[PDB]
């Protein structure tokens, strides 16, 4: 277990010490079963952090300023495929203001992507299309 | 309580009244503990509705034409986090035809995500892509 965390038996504690994204440990031990990450400043979780733990039974993620946006799509993507659902009943959002107090496991893709896109809605392929049509105008 | 519905104390009743996706009231009362929507036209539920009622115990959603796609993901997730699962055994997918007659609570998130086809839905513009490359060859 990393220095910011404390590994007691098969349980790991990484909460209540105000961990941010930058100071979050890069990787976790294989054998950990329960991980409590309560009371930090975690805006969103890095992709592939909680999906690489084979023995993870319950993870506590409450009491954090979760920012539900594009970068939070990973963590929610890991929430659907979980047998137990009790310790995720009251996960809340704190930003953006349009989605204040939204329960985390009840989020759709479009809602998370609306704030992800600065405003080019419906851009499934539009992003490079605008640039290249402008570029073709630029040529001739 | 909203005008199209009928409220009685904590309970709210909005069944058998031709209620559509756009005619749903924006926000039901916070205190509500049982909402019924049987025998309506609801294709899916808008996001942010079922999670704004923390006191909900049961909800009746049968006998409705549920389109099982990405937009219905907010409902299905709410269906997973319920202690009692008695009245959710008759939620069938009226559409798409790829998932005709499937019970909703047993639908994994794999099936619903694939319905809002990221590729198959859009490409009436596959010929448009071919046209981009072909007339770029014209320029080239």
């Amino acid at each position: 277990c990393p220095a910011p965390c404390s590994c007691a038996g098969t349980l790991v504690d990484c909460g209540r010490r105000g961990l941010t994204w930058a100071s979050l440990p890069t990787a976790f031990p294989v054998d950990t079963t329960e991980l409590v990450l309560t009371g930090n400043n975690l805006t969103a979780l890095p992709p592939g952090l909680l999906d690489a733990l084979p023995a993870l039974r319950t993870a506590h993620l409450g009491a954090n300023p979760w920012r539900c946006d594009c970068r939070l799509v990973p963590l929610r993507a890991w929430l659907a495929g979980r047998p137990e659902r009790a310790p995720y009943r009251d996960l809340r959002c704190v930003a953006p203001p349009a989605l204040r107090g939204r329960l985390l496991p009840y989020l759709a893709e479009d809602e998370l992507r609306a704030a992800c896109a600065p405003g080019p809605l419906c851009w499934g392929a539009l992003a490079a299309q605008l640039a290249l049509l402008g570029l073709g105008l630029l040529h001739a | 309580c909203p005008a199209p519905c009928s409220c009685a104390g904590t309970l709210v009743d909005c069944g058998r009244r031709g209620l559509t996706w756009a005619s749903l009231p924006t926000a039901f009362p916070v205190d509500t503990t049982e909402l019924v929507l049987t025998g309506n036209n609801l294709t899916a539920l808008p996001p942010g509705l079922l999670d704004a009622l923390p006191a909900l115990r049961t909800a009746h959603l049968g006998a409705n034409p549920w389109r099982c796609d990405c937009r219905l993901v907010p409902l299905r997730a709410w269906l997973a986090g319920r202690p009692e699962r008695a009245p959710y055994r008759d939620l069938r997918c009226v559409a798409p035809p790829a998932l005709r007659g499937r019970l909703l609570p047993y639908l994994a998130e794999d099936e619903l995500r694939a319905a809002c086809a990221p590729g198959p839905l859009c490409w009436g513009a596959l010929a448009a892509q071919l046209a981009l490359l072909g007339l770029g060859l014209l320029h080239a």
Binding site: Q129, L137 | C122, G124
Partner: peptide, 22 residues
């Protein structure tokens, strides 16, 4: 279809500007 409709007019428009170039 719909989500490509907004750039449907846009592929053809830059494409026709290229037709002007040719």
């Amino acid at each position: 279809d719909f989500c490509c409709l907004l750039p449907l007019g846009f592929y053809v428009l830059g494409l026709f500007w290229l037709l002007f170039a040719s």
